[PDB]
Symmetry: none
């Protein structure tokens, strides 16, 4: 018979990397 | 014959973006 | 018939953790 339809989309990706380091503190 | 089953689930999506900048440092 | 082909890639991940605190002022 015909091939079946395409499977479901995969799961979402994983969390991204940690963000950039923050600014210097106030004086 | 009938059409075949649905295909397998896709791959996991792409990695998320880097996070927000950190907070200000200590004084 | 044969099973279908693999599905599409999933949706994008969420943003990561906050970065580290900065250095001293």
């Amino acid at each position: 018979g015909p091939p079946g339809p395409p499977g479901p989309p995969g799961p979402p990706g994983k969390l991204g990397p940690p963000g950039p380091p923050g600014p210097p503190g106030p004086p």
